[PDB]
Amino acid sequence: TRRAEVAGGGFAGLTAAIALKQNGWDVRLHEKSSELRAFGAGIYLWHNGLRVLEGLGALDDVLQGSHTPPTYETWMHNKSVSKETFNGLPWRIMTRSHLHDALVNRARALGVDISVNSEAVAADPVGRLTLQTGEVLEADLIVGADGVGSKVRDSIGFKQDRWVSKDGLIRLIVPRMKKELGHGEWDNTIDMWNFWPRVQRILYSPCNENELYLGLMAPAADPRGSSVPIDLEVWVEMFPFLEPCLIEAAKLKTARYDKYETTKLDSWTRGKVALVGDAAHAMCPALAQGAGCAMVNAFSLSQDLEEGSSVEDALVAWETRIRPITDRCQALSGDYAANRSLSKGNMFTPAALEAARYDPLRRVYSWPQ
Amino acid sequence: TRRAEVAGGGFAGLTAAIALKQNGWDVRLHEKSSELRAFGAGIYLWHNGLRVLEGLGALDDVLQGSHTPPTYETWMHNKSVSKETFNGLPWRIMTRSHLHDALVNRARALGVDISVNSEAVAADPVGRLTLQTGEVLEADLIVGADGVGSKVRDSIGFKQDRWVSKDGLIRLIVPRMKKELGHGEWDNTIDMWNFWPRVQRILYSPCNENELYLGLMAPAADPRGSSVPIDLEVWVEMFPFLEPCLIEAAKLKTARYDKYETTKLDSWTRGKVALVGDAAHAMCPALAQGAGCAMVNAFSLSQDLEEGSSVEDALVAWETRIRPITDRCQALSGDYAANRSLSKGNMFTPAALEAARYDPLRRVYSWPQ
Amino acid sequence: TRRAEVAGGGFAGLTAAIALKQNGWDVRLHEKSSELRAFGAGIYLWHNGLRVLEGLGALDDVLQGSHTPPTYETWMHNKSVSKETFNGLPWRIMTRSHLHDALVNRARALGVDISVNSEAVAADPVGRLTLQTGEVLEADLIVGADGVGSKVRDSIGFKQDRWVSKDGLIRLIVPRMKKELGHGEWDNTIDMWNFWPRVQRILYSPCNENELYLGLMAPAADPRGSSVPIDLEVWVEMFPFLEPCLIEAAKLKTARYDKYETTKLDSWTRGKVALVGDAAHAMCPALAQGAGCAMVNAFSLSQDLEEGSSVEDALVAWETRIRPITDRCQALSGDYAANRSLSKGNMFTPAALEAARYDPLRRVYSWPQ
Amino acid sequence: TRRAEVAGGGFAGLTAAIALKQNGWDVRLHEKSSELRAFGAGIYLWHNGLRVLEGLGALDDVLQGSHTPPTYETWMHNKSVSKETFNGLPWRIMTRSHLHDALVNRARALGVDISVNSEAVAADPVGRLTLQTGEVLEADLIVGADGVGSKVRDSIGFKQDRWVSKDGLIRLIVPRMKKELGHGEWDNTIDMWNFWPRVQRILYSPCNENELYLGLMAPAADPRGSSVPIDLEVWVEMFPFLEPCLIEAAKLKTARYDKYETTKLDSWTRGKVALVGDAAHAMCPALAQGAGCAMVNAFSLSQDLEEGSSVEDALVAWETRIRPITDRCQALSGDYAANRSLSKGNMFTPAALEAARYDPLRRVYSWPQ
Ligand SMILES: Cc1cc2nc3c(=O)[nH]c(=O)nc-3n(C[C@H](O)[C@H](O)[C@H](O)COP(=O)(O)OP(=O)(O)OC[C@H]3O[C@@H](n4cnc5c(N)ncnc54)[C@H](O)[C@@H]3O)c2cc1C
Ligand SMILES: Cc1cc2nc3c(=O)[nH]c(=O)nc-3n(C[C@H](O)[C@H](O)[C@H](O)COP(=O)(O)OP(=O)(O)OC[C@H]3O[C@@H](n4cnc5c(N)ncnc54)[C@H](O)[C@@H]3O)c2cc1C
Ligand SMILES: Cc1cc2nc3c(=O)[nH]c(=O)nc-3n(C[C@H](O)[C@H](O)[C@H](O)COP(=O)(O)OP(=O)(O)OC[C@H]3O[C@@H](n4cnc5c(N)ncnc54)[C@H](O)[C@@H]3O)c2cc1C
Ligand SMILES: Cc1cc2nc3c(=O)[nH]c(=O)nc-3n(C[C@H](O)[C@H](O)[C@H](O)COP(=O)(O)OP(=O)(O)OC[C@H]3O[C@@H](n4cnc5c(N)ncnc54)[C@H](O)[C@@H]3O)c2cc1C
Ligand SMILES: O=C(O)c1cncc(O)c1
Ligand SMILES: O=C(O)c1cncc(O)c1
Ligand SMILES: O=C(O)c1cncc(O)c1
Ligand SMILES: O=C(O)c1cncc(O)c1
Ligand code: NA
Ligand code: NA
Ligand code: NA
Ligand code: NA
Numbered sequence A, B, C, D: 001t002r003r004a005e006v007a008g009g010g011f012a013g014l015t016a017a018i019a020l021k022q023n024g025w026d027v028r029l030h031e032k033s034s035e036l037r038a039f040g041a042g043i044y045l046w047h048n049g050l051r052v053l054e055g056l057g058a059l060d061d062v063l064q065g066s067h068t069p070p071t072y073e074t075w076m077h078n079k080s081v082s083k084e085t086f087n088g089l090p091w092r093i094m095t096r097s098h099l100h101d102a103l104v105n106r107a108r109a110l111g112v113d114i115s116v117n118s119e120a121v122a123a124d125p126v127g128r129l130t131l132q133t134g135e136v137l138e139a140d141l142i143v144g145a146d147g148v149g150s151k152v153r154d155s156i157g158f159k160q161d162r163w164v165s166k167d168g169l170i171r172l173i174v175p176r177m178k179k180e181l182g183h184g185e186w187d188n189t190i191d192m193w194n195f196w197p198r199v200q201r202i203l204y205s206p207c208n209e210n211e212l213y214l215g216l217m218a219p220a221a222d223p224r225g226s227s228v229p230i231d232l233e234v235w236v237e238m239f240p241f242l243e244p245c246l247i248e249a250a251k252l253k254t255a256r257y258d259k260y261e262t263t264k265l266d267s268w269t270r271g272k273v274a275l276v277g278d279a280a281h282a283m284c285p286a287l288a289q290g291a292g293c294a295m296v297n298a299f300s301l302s303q304d305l306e307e308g309s310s311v312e313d314a315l316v317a318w319e320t321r322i323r324p325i326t327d328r329c330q331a332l333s334g335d336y337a338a339n340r341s342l343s344k345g346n347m348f349t350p351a352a353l354e355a356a357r358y359d360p361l362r363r364v365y366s367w368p369q
C-alpha cells in the first residue's frame, strides 16, 4: 500500500488526505495546532470547490446549513451598482467551521489518521518528513499543505516571492438580525464600498438563517476603522443600516485585524514532495478563490497519482496540468485588489470566473457566461 | 450483447437510448414522425434533469446557449408577489429544439441506431416489437417512450386513467426585444397572473440572449384569448409592457392552442417492456417536471439494468425504486394546477421541489431548502 | 343694517354666515342639532376651498394641524398605477372637526349669533323664516344651508331630482400607526382599489402626524365588507399592509355605513331665499368637491350681495354667475363614480380639476395644468 | 401726485415700480442695459414670492408656463437621500426670462415709464437722482434696485461688507429631453451632489414641459469642471444619466462660470432713498430666496409708504419691520453654503423655510411645518 504524509489540517491538507484515502493510499495528516480549527470567520465556495466537495463525498454536509444568496450585489456609497448571478454558476457561503467540520468528519469516516500537536519541520524530496518531536516518517508522497509559512517548502528551499500587506480587515460571525434590518434584500451578498467620507467597506455575507459573515475593511493607517474590538461609532456612521449587526460585532473581544498575504513559487514539486494551497499560491481574496484553487489543486494531485507513473513524474505532470488556472486567477485577483475593480460592480466577467467555471471531476470548463 | 428497442424519439426515449448505449447495450430507437423534432417551444429543467444530462454526457451542449434567470418571479395583477431562487438549486431554461438537438447529437455520437418514419404499433412482454412496416424486432428490452398515446402501452393493455383538459395555452418562441422592453428585470422568469378583468396569464421565460419563450394561457371558453394566431389586442391590453414581444408573437401562423393532458397507470412494466415518460406519467406542468421525471426515470432504468438480475426483475425493481418521486410530483403538480397555487407566489416549497432536489447519479436528495 | 338668517351650521352655513358678517350683515345662524358638530371623519379641500378660507380669515387655523400629502397615489390590486401632484395646485386633508372648529371659532370671533336646537321648518320668499319653536324671524336674506333634506327648500317647493344610493362606505379616524406600517410612502394619499377577489377599496388619507382618515368602501350586498363595526378579517385579508390601522378601526363602535346621496334643482333662489351646499347640489364624492363647491357658492353669494342691487336681483345674478362650475363638477363626479374612473389613476385631468382651479377671491382660474 | 424714480430693471426694481404704480405713484424706472433682460437661466420662487406676484397682479402670467415639481429630491453619489414637499408650501421653477417678461408686461400694462440705456450714477437723500446722461431727476422717493454694484448706494456711501467668491457655477437652459432620459422621476427637482471622485454637483430644475434649468457646480481650481463651454466628458462621467441634456448643454457658446456674491449693509435707507434687492442684501443661493426676499422687500416698501407718514419715516419703519427676515435668511443660506448642508438632504427645516413661509399680503407666516 502506498503511504502519504500530509502536513497541515487546513482545507488543502484535508482535501488531499480525503482524495488520497479514497484512492487507497495509507494517509496520515499532521496538524501543528493543538486542536483542529479554521480561522477567518466565513468563506465563499464556487462551482469548482463544490465539485471538489462532491468528489470528496463531503458536499451533502456542506450544502446543509450553508447559503446561496439570491444575488451577489455591489454598492458604491450606498447606491446599488450591480446585481450578479453568474448565469447559474453554483456558489455558496458558509462559516469556516462549517466547511472545516464537513472535511474533518469525512476524513475521520474514511479512516485518515489525524494527529494534532504534530508539526512538520523538515521534508526531504526522497520521501522523509521530520516532525518537531524528532519522529522521522518515511513515505511515498509528502504533501506540504502547511500554509503561507510552509516549513515543508522552506526546509527544501523554493525560489519565491512573498508579500504581507500593511492593510487588512476584520472578519466576524454575528447573528443575522434579519427582522431588525427591516426593509431590504438581506439574504444577498452585498459588497458595500465607500471612498468618501473615508475609505471603509463591508462585505456582507449571509451563511445561513442564523449566521452572518462580515468583513470590515479599512486601511491600517486609519486608527479607528482598523481597531479591534471594532470602533462601533465609525462603522455605524457609514453603515447605519447594519447597526443591529454591528452592535453584536462590537461585543467580540476575539476580533482581529488580519493582513493580506501572497505567495508565488517557481515550482510546486521536488521529488516526492508536492506543495498545495497557501504553501504554494496564497493570493488576494478579490475573486474568493484561494481555498477553491487550493482544493482543486489538492484533488487534482490525487488524480495524477492514479496514472500508473512514478510519484515524481505524477507530481511534475500535475503542476503542468493544473497550475496555469491558479497562476491566472492569482494574477487577476491581485490586479482586482490593487485597482479596487470590484468597487465598479459587474466585474465577475468570464475571465474573472475562469477558476470557478473549472470542473475538476470531468476536467472541463462548465457554466458558460 | 444485450439488445434494446426504444419506441419514441422524445426526451424520454433519447435519454433511455443514450444511457443504455453508454452501458454497452445494442440500442435502436424508432421515431414515428418523418423528422426528429421537439414541439412545445421552450422548457425548464432543474437540478434533477441537469444531473441526468451530466450522466448522459450531454450537459455541456445544453448549458451553452441556455439561460438561468437571476430569479423566478411571480406577478399577480402586475404586482410582484414573490422572487424565488431555491437556495442555489440549479435550474435552466432553453428552447425545446436546443435540448432535443443536444440529446440527438449525443445519441448519434455514441452510435445509437435512429430510425425515422418508424412507428411501434405492438409490443409483446416476451421481447418483440412490431413496427407499422410489419417488421418484428426481437429484443432483451423494449422501452415504451412513445408519449401520452403510447401504442407500446395500449397494445399490451395497462389499467389507466387519462385526462385531456378543455383548457390549454399558446407556447411560442419570439425574439427577446430586451432593449424595447425598457426598464425592468427582463432576464427573470416572470409568471404574470391575472383573474381581472379577465383570466389571462403569461409565463415569461428567457431561453438565451436571443430567444424568449412565452406561454399565453387563457380558458378555451374565451374565444379571443384562446385564438391562434394570437389576438394581439387582448394580450397587449393586459400585458402592455410585453407589447414589443407580443407584436412578434402575432406574426406566428404556426401558433397552436395545446391542451393539457395527464396519464397515470397501475404499473409501468410488463415482462421485458418498460414504459417511460408521458407514456406512463404525463402530468400538469405547474412544477415544470414532466420531462425532468421522464429523464430521471429513463436514466434510472439503465441503472437498474446493471445489477446482474434478469431484465424482468430489474424492471420491477426500477419502478419500485423510482416511481414514488414521480407519483408525488404528479399529484402535487395537479393540485397546484387545480388550485392555481402558483398565483400566490412563494410556492416552490421543499415539498414542491422534491423531484428537482433528487440527484439520480448519487441517488440522494441534494440542495436542501 | 341688513339682516340675514342662515339655516344650518355645516360648512355651507358657517361660510355664508362668516362672509356676510365680514360685509356688515347682522347674521344669525340656526343649527337643528343640540351641538355644533361635523360628521364624516375627514375631508379634502383644494385651492378653491382654501381660497374661501383665506377670504373668511379662517385659513391659518385650518392649515395648522392639517396635511398636504407629498402625492396623491392610486393603487389597483396593490400595484401603484399613478402618482399625481396637480402641478402645484394647493390641496389639504383634515378631520371634519378640524375644519368645523376653525369655522365656528371664526364665526364666534366675528359675533355671528349661533343658536343650537334651532331648526328652520318653513321659509317664505318675502323674507320670513319659521323655526320649530314657532318663532317667525323677518330678514332681508334667508340662506338655506340645511343639507340634503333642506326644509328651507322643501317648504317653498323646488323642482328636483334626489337620489340615495344603496351602496356606501365606512369613514373613520384612527391613529396613524406610522412606525407600525413599516416601509412605504405612508404620508401619501393612497386610493387602494380592488375588484378581485372582491370589490373592496380603501381611501387612505393622512390628516396630520396623529390622525388617519380611512374610507372603507364595499357594496351593500356584501354583508361582511359593509358591516359595522368593521369585519376586521375581510379588510385585513385584502389590505394586510394596513393591519395596524385596521385593528384600531375595528374598536370603533360608532362606525356607520353611510350611503351616497345627490341633489339637483332647477333653481337655487326664490325671492330673498338662497339655497347653498347640499341643499342645492349634493354630489358624488369622486372629485372631493362637495364642500369645496358649497363653500365657494356661499362665499360667492356674499360677493353678489355687495353690488348695490336688490337682494332678489343679487341672488339671480349669483346663481347665473357661479352655478355652471358646480353643475359641471357634479356631472363629472357622478360620471367618475359610475364608471369607477378613479380606479385607472391619472384621472385628475384639467377638466376634473376645473372646480379646484377656480379662485373665488379674484374670480379667475389659477394653477394651470 | 407722488413721484418715484427707480434705478434698475431687475426683479427688485420691477416689483417696486409695479407696487408703487398700483398705489397711485408716478413711477419711472431706469435700466442701465440697452435691453430689458434677465441673466442666470432659471429661478425658484416660493410662497413668499408667489404672494408678491399675486399682490402685483402678475401671478397668472408666471404660473402659466412654469413648473412645480412633484418633489424636491436630493442625491449624494447617485443615492437618493431625501424627498421634500414642504407640507404643501407653494413653490415654482421657471426661466429667468419667464419671470422677467411677466413683470415687464405688468409694469407696461400699468403705465410705468421704463427707460433703457438709463444708468443712475448718483443719488441724493433729499430726492435727486442723476443719470449718466447728466439728467437730474427730482423725486419724492428714490429706489436703489441697481444690483450688487449699486451706484445709488455707493454714491451716498453705506457701510458694507461685500464678498465675491472664487468659486461659482454654470447655469444653462436646455431642452428637457424627457423621453431620452428614460426611466426615472424627471419632473423632480434633483440636487445631485458628489465629493468623489471629484467635487461636482448638478442642480436639475425643470421649468416646464420644454425647458430644463441646469446648474453645473465645480470649484474654480478644477480647470475642466469650471470650463465654458462645458467640458462634456467630465460632466457625462459623473452624471451619465443626464447625457442627453448635457450634449445639448455643450453646444451653448454663451455659457458662463459665474461667481457667487454677497452684500450686507448697516442700513438700507437714507432720507428719501431706499435700497432694495442685491443692492442691499445679496446672499448665497442655498435657500433659493435672493429674489424672493428682494421682491418681498420691494413690495413691503410700497406698503409702508401707504401709512400717511413722511417718506423718510416710512422708509425707516419699512427696514425695521422687514429686514430681520432677510438678515436671518441671508445668514442661514451662507451657513448652508459653507457647511454644504444641502448635501445631507432633509434640510428645508422650519427655520430654513421661514422666509418662504412669510406672506407679505397679510403680513403673517403661513404653511406651517
Ligand atoms: C481575508 C481573506 C478572505 C478569504 N476569502 C476566501 C473565500 O471567500 N473563498 C476562498 O476559497 N478562499 C478565501 N481565502 C483564501 C483562503 O483563506 C486560503 O486560501 C485557504 O484557507 C488556504 O488553505 P490551506 O489549507 O492552504 O492553508 P491554511 O488554511 O493556512 O491551513 C494550514 C494548516 O496547516 C497548519 N500548519 C502550519 N504549519 C504547519 C506545519 N509546519 N506542520 C503541520 N501543520 C502546519 C496550520 O495550523 C493550519 O491549520 C481568503 C483569504 C483571506 C486572507
Ligand atoms: C404546456 C406544457 C409545458 C411543459 N413544460 C415543461 C417544463 O418546463 N419542463 C419539463 O421538464 N417538462 C415540461 N412539460 C412536460 C414535457 O413536455 C413532457 O413530459 C415530455 O416532453 C415528455 O417526453 P416523452 O419523451 O415522454 O414524450 P414526447 O415528448 O411526447 O415524445 C414522444 C415521441 O414519440 C413519438 N411517438 C409517438 N408514438 C410513437 C410510436 N407508436 N412509435 C414511435 N414513436 C412514437 C412522438 O412522435 C414523439 O417524438 C410540459 C408539458 C406541457 C403540456
Ligand atoms: C362619503 C363622502 C365623502 C366626501 N368627501 C368630501 C371631500 O373630501 N371634500 C369635500 O369638499 N366634500 C366632500 N363631501 C361632500 C361634503 O360632505 C358635503 O358637500 C358638505 O359637508 C355639505 O355641507 P353643507 O353645509 O351643505 O351640509 P351639511 O354638512 O349636511 O350641514 C347641514 C347642517 O344643517 C343642519 N340642519 C339640517 N336641517 C336643518 C334645519 N331644517 N334647520 C337648521 N339646521 C338644519 C344639520 O344638522 C347640519 O349640521 C363628501 C361627501 C360624502 C358623502
Ligand atoms: C447662482 C445663483 C442662483 C440663484 N438662484 C435663485 C433662486 O432660485 N431664487 C431666487 O429667488 N433667487 C435666486 N438668486 C438670487 C437672485 O438672482 C437675485 O437676488 C436677484 O436677481 C436680484 O434682483 P435685483 O433686482 O436686486 O438685482 P439684479 O437682478 O442684479 O438687477 C439689477 C438691474 O439693475 C441694472 N443696473 C445695475 N446698475 C444700474 C444703475 N446704476 N442704473 C440703472 N440700472 C442699473 C442691471 O443691469 C440689472 O438689470 C440666485 C443667485 C445666484 C448668484
Ligand atoms: O477583499 C476582497 O475584495 C474580497 C472579495 N471577495 C471575498 C472576500 O473575502 C474578500
Ligand atoms: O401551467 C403552468 O402552471 C406552468 C408552470 N411552470 C411551467 C410551465 O410550462 C407551465
Ligand atoms: O368615493 C370616492 O371616489 C371618493 C374620492 N375622493 C374622496 C372621497 O371622499 C371619496
Ligand atoms: O448653490 C445652491 O446651493 C443652490 C441651492 N438652491 C438653488 C440654487 O440656485 C443654488
Ligand atoms: Na483561483
Ligand atoms: Na484566486
Ligand atoms: Na416530477
Ligand atoms: Na411533476
Ligand code: NA
Pocket (backbone or CB within 6 Å): C289, C290, C292, C293, C325, C326, C329, C330, C355
Ligand atoms: Na364642485
Ligand code: NA
Pocket (backbone or CB within 6 Å): C283, C284, C287, C288, C289, C290, C293, C329, C330, C333, C355
Ligand atoms: Na363635485
Ligand code: NA
Pocket (backbone or CB within 6 Å): D289, D290, D292, D293, D325, D326, D329, D330, D355
Ligand atoms: Na430670504
Ligand code: NA
Pocket (backbone or CB within 6 Å): D283, D284, D287, D288, D289, D290, D293, D329, D330, D333, D355
Ligand atoms: Na436667503
